[PDB]
A paper describes a structure:
Many sequence differences between different SARS-[name]-2 variants and variant sublineages have been mapped to the spike protein (S protein), a homotrimeric glycosylated membrane fusion protein. S protein initiates cell entry by associating with the major host cell receptor, the human angiotensin-converting enzyme 2 (ACE2), via its receptor-binding domain (RBD, residues 319–541 in SARS-[name]-2). We report the application of ancestral sequence reconstruction on coronavirus spike protein, resulting in stable and highly soluble ancestral scaffold antigens (AnSAs). Cryogenic electron microscopy (cryo-EM) structures with high local resolution indicate how an intricate network of hydrogen bonds between the RBD and N-terminal domain (NTD) maintains the AnSAs in a closed pre-fusion conformation.
Nodes 3 and 5 were selected because they are closely related to the extant S protein sequence of SARS-[name]-2. The ancestral sequences representing these nodes were referred to as AnSA-3, AnSA-5, AnSA-6 and AnSA-9 and share 83, 79, 80 and 55 % sequence identity with extant SARS-[name]-2 S protein (Wuhan wt), respectively. One dataset of each protein was collected in one session and readily yielded 3D reconstructions at an overall resolution of 2.59 and 2.77 Å for AnSA-5 and AnSA-6, respectively. For instance, S284 (A292 in SARS-[name]-2 S protein) creates a novel hydrogen bond between its sidechain (NTD) to the backbone of F310 that is located immediately adjacent to the RBD domain (bottom left). Additionally, the sidechain of Q602 (SD2) forms a hydrogen bond to the backbone of C512 (RBD), thus forming a stabilized tri-loop interface between the NTD-, RBD and SD2 domain of one monomer (bottom left). Besides altering inter-domain interfaces, several surface mutations in AnSA-5 are involved in hydrogen bonding across monomers. For example, the RBD in monomer A and the NTD in monomer B are held together by a hydrogen bond bridging S386 and E490 in the RBD (N394 and E516 in SARS-[name]-2 S protein) and a salt bridge connecting E490 (RBD) and K226 in the NTD domain (D228 in SARS-[name]-2 S protein) (top right). Similarly, the protomer interface between RBD (monomer A), NTD (monomer B) and S2 helix/loop (monomer B) is stabilized by hydrogen bonds between sidechains of S815 (S2) and E273 (NTD) (A854 and E281 in SARS-[name]-2 S protein) as well as N274 (NTD) and Q534 (RBD) (N282 and L560 in SARS-[name]-2 S protein) (bottom right).
Author numbering:
A (entry chain A): 664 to 1010
B (entry chain C): 267 to 650, 659 to 713
C (entry chain C): 912 to 1110
D (entry chain A): 317 to 415
The structure:
Amino acid sequence: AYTMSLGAENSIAYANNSIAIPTNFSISVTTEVMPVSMAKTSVDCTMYICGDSQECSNLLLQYGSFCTQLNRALTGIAIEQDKNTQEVFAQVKQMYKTPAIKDFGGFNFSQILPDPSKPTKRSFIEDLLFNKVTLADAGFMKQYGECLGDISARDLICAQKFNGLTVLPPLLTDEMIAAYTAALVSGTATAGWTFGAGAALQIPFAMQMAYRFNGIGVTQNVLYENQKQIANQFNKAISQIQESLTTTSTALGKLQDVVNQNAQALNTLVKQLSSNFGAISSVLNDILSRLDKVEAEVQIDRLITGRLQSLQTYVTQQLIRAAEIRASANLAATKMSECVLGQSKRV
Amino acid sequence: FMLKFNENGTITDAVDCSQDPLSELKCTLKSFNVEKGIYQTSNFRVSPTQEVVRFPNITNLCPFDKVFNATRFPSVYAWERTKISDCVADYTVLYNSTSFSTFKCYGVSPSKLIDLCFTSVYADTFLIRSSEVRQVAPGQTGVIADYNYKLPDDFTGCVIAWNTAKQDAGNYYYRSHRKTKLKPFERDLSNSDENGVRTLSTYDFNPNVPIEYQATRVVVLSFELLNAPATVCGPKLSTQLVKNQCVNFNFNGLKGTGVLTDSSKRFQSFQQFGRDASDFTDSVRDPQTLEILDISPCSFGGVSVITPGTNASSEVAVLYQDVNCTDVPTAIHADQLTPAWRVYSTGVNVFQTQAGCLIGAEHVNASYECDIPIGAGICASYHTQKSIVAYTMSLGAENSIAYANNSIAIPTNFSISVTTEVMPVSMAKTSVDCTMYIC
Amino acid sequence: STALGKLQDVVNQNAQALNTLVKQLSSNFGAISSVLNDILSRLDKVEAEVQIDRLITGRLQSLQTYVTQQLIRAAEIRASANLAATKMSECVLGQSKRVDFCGKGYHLMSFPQAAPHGVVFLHVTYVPSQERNFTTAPAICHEGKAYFPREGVFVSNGTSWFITQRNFYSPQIITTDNTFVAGNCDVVIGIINNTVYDP
Amino acid sequence: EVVRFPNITNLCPFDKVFNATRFPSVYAWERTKISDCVADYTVLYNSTSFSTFKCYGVSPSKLIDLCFTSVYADTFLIRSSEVRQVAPGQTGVIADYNY
Ligand SMILES: *[C@@H]1O[C@H](CO)[C@@H](O[C@@H]2O[C@H](CO)[C@@H](O)[C@H](O)[C@H]2NC(C)=O)[C@H](O)[C@H]1NC(C)=O
Ligand SMILES: *[C@@H]1O[C@H](CO)[C@@H](O[C@@H]2O[C@H](CO)[C@@H](O)[C@H](O)[C@H]2NC(C)=O)[C@H](O)[C@H]1NC(C)=O
Ligand SMILES: *[C@@H]1O[C@H](CO)[C@@H](O[C@@H]2O[C@H](CO)[C@@H](O)[C@H](O)[C@H]2NC(C)=O)[C@H](O)[C@H]1NC(C)=O
Ligand SMILES: *[C@@H]1O[C@H](CO)[C@@H](O)[C@H](O)[C@H]1NC(C)=O
Ligand SMILES: *[C@@H]1O[C@H](CO)[C@@H](O)[C@H](O)[C@H]1NC(C)=O
Ligand SMILES: *[C@@H]1O[C@H](CO)[C@@H](O)[C@H](O)[C@H]1NC(C)=O
Ligand SMILES: *[C@@H]1O[C@H](CO)[C@@H](O)[C@H](O)[C@H]1NC(C)=O
Ligand SMILES: *[C@@H]1O[C@H](CO)[C@@H](O)[C@H](O)[C@H]1NC(C)=O
Ligand SMILES: *[C@@H]1O[C@H](CO)[C@@H](O)[C@H](O)[C@H]1NC(C)=O
Ligand SMILES: *[C@@H]1O[C@H](CO)[C@@H](O)[C@H](O)[C@H]1NC(C)=O
Ligand SMILES: *[C@@H]1O[C@H](CO)[C@@H](O)[C@H](O)[C@H]1NC(C)=O
Ligand SMILES: *[C@@H]1O[C@H](CO)[C@@H](O)[C@H](O)[C@H]1NC(C)=O
Ligand SMILES: *[C@@H]1O[C@H](CO)[C@@H](O)[C@H](O)[C@H]1NC(C)=O
Ligand SMILES: *[C@@H]1O[C@H](CO)[C@@H](O)[C@H](O)[C@H]1NC(C)=O
Ligand SMILES: *[C@@H]1O[C@H](CO)[C@@H](O)[C@H](O)[C@H]1NC(C)=O
């Protein structure tokens, strides 16, 4: 046990007549990871609560619109996940095809553009990102026959499907997302910022970087006078991204934990069906087998209200988490416009 | 059915919710008119029409005569326990011969006894005066409950008693005092104390005594309903199996509904049913063949109905989520469906989307802007006659930039643009009088 | 009609939430009746209170649901109101360099207009149009030393080299006023030879 | 378990309350206060069997280890048919017009 270090100890050699001027520079490439969407969860509220039984379903009608109101909430979450994706990507709906030459002024975009030798039209970097996040529960999409196996084939995802819990697929497939990012990097490589304001105007890439140096307040000559250095520093920095993404799993933790949180929530929701909630049994057919309506209904009501309470908890948690994902998607959409479609003075 | 009631309270419209996918949509949305969209739809397609009842073929009738009509019962201090096993509990044979002034059951309804099966039964028997049968219940107190025969709080079973003042004349004993109460189903046969005088009081039973003092026989049946072989069953006859259909079933008194199939499951030698982490009973041992059947939900898998507005058309399309188009007629139990739904099982206008099989929308190779979002790149629209068409959505216009290392495009003109951005700032300031709403 | 859909759906969502809350009073929640006086008329307190408790708990649960949805929706409206307040400061009370913040194109102005439960911004933007291809060079070499554009870019109309501002073609004579000189012209890749006029 | 109870020791007057020479007519039911005594009701097990023993707000099995801040005993004679009317929420000639 120890006290935290707040930071490195440092001092500034202040004097009323002294200044430090940088004599050199480093081109730095930095990775920012942002969540944009979450799993479009869906619930058959009758199948979850009453588990395919008429007696319970006829009791559940006496609770009114609770189920309809929960489904209305979750479909609101689901539609919002597609909105989030189409607000971050799809800001530019000119599908600028990837240029045939991936080197501009010495800057080697080949790792961040698609490669036509591969079967999947991702960039090389995007292939690393799609490998480095894992859908640790095998990621839903359980095929029609797959839940009818031996004992060892039992699976919380089959327990989910049998109890009415499902994940809808996103509207944009990954090939469509990769097509937008390919178009966005292609416009930046060949038309700079202009295609964010209007029609894309081609400009030579070094000449575009020279304007970007002026935006920083480094004189235009300092680019051309060092263009091979600057391009090499850029190329090496991109390679360091590729090396870190191939080696290191923690980089995308902000996305893996969105997967983990939503997987865990669905797992607790199915497991809550094993609770009695003070009924004689957690099992609905066991009550209906063993008790007659005059007193079964008292036991069923304990299950209905407890199960129904467990759904309302889950939907509230999803509404909370969805608001956080929306805020991240709104921020990511702002960074697309301001960092990709332009140059930002915002420190 | 969903029924629309007029202000005069006459029915003016109705939807048969099982009829077709539009009817299921209307019933799912609790509404007779539906806006354009795609909606998750609750299963009204299928309901069980059959019972699959299967019970062990044990045929020996339970020993009601030997247990109830024994020549004499025990003194309550010396109550006797017997195991009842491998028999059919057709208790209706008694209706001809006795009437019980108490028949009271715990954890089981008495009307259910005729179609349950029990993994264990023990009958306890003793004689007490009629006023004391009151005390033979969980949580009771009194000379019987304290010092002669205690039921547990977790008791499941039935207490049965009848007057026998004509039969059970004589002397019978009960413990009036003890230094500590009995534990549940404890017995204490000690007659003499340390010095030799008896610790037991005597019932004097005669038909001449007042009713409250007259002898009643009591039988206490204690039950178990474990995940173990059935030992006593009600008289139910067994039916044939009906696999691959949504049915009601009853295996050893475990009722339910679902789809039965063969299964790969290894059960334990004693095990009668299996449950997943949700306690959903996913398998059962057939008591007739000892084969293990899988139980699937009748409603299993997601279904969604795609519609223009019902103001626009009564045409719909159905998405069978994660189902392959050749499996739809079996994932949906299309043999059990109406003809109007079975149209949406098969035929032309089936299209395998990565979201699932889409049926009833014709696939079109022209891409358009997304109208109704089906998923995984597919959208649908009500499109020119009109029909529901399904297509891959267009991401944007095809374009290319004429890049060269020495070419630049400069704007020669400009447009002043005025753009409208609409932003919500407020919502209605709702308020609730919580007492007026609730009470 | 669709232009204000973002306002109409705030109205619609809040109307629908109140309508479902009144309709929820029609539920029994497993009581013998949804109607409170019907229970109290028909049952004695010893056992009416068991039925009344089922109504109280289910009704109170329905309020807790409604209030939770309102807290969620109010957090969303607050984020929209904070963003609208930021656009008032940055797009109305100034001019914003933030690329897509005050509408598409380069922001000139915007005007706020009141709307029910909302604001409408009329964003005014310059959109460049009718672009034309030009040959261009990073620098001019005049007398062994490299001249760079002071602002804009060097372009030629085929015959002649000019300096123009980048967002509107207005060619100027390349003058020691329009340009700064920095270093010998060997280093600049793509350097070209042209006169620089000296007034 | 730390069990601590007041050290009152006088046994409650079960014989005088229950085995009185006669009970009141139900219209003239009599109330008596019971106080400063130990309610070891098991002394009755030897001598009297009760065809009704029904408790409200307390389980009868818990009577042996509770203490009460007041006790009153109401006593009256009725026909056995009518004892069902001696309960909360009952009706009938007793519940309406006698007790
Ligand atoms: C900034 O520092 C780098 C070294 O980190 C300098 O790069 C070296 O430059 C000399 C002469 O140009 C070469 O001989 C070395 O091989 C270079 N090394 C590397 C790693 O590039 C660079 O010149 C410095 N920049 C400026 C403007 O002086
Ligand atoms: C751009 O970067 C790549 C390195 O990623 C350069 O080298 C090629 O890299 C791929 C793997 O990424 C190999 O399969 C090729 O064989 C490599 N080619 C060579 C010649 O080494 C690529 O050359 C770079 N482009 C430019 C124009 O420098
Ligand atoms: C920009 O384009 C507009 C047309 O879109 C030009 O305006 C036209 O100019 C001619 C001659 O002056 C008129 O006859 C037309 O009526 C004008 N059109 C409109 C809509 O007013 C304008 O001259 C161009 N600007 C520049 C700087 O070239
Ligand atoms: C559905 O089709 C895919 C091939 O497109 C196949 O991999 C999968 O196993 C099929 N599902 C079933 C249940 O046969
Ligand atoms: C209700 O009944 C009255 C009288 O029969 C009739 O005039 C009125 O039109 C009815 N209302 C509706 C909505 O049909
Ligand atoms: C019912 O009792 C009659 C005589 O009282 C007897 O003949 C008959 O066999 C009895 N039936 C059963 C089922 O015990
Ligand atoms: C009990 O058994 C005796 C002897 O067989 C018989 O006479 C009597 O009728 C039986 N009682 C009942 C209720 O069956
Ligand atoms: C009775 O049970 C046995 C064992 O479970 C089985 O072999 C037999 O087929 C069943 N039915 C008949 C009619 O024998
Ligand atoms: C759409 O294009 C595919 C090409 O793979 C073709 O097979 C199919 O017949 C086309 N559909 C129509 C309706 O023309
Ligand atoms: C610029 O040149 C390319 C090829 O010469 C051409 O495709 C493009 O349309 C030109 N742009 C303009 C604005 O004329
Ligand atoms: C280029 O512009 C100059 C204007 O000073 C003009 O004299 C020359 O002819 C132009 N050339 C072409 C090809 O337009
Ligand atoms: C531009 O490209 C041409 C070949 O297309 C080449 O000859 C020339 O040296 C290049 N110049 C620059 C500045 O990239
Ligand atoms: C520019 O001028 C210098 C000196 O006159 C000459 O050496 C060089 O080759 C020229 N460049 C071109 C491209 O003509
Ligand atoms: C009531 O008191 C009388 C007189 O002492 C006694 O004979 C009788 O047995 C008592 N009753 C009971 C039930 O103890
Ligand atoms: C119990 O009854 C006996 C007589 O049967 C009597 O002698 C004894 O005192 C009684 N005990 C109590 C505690 O009343």
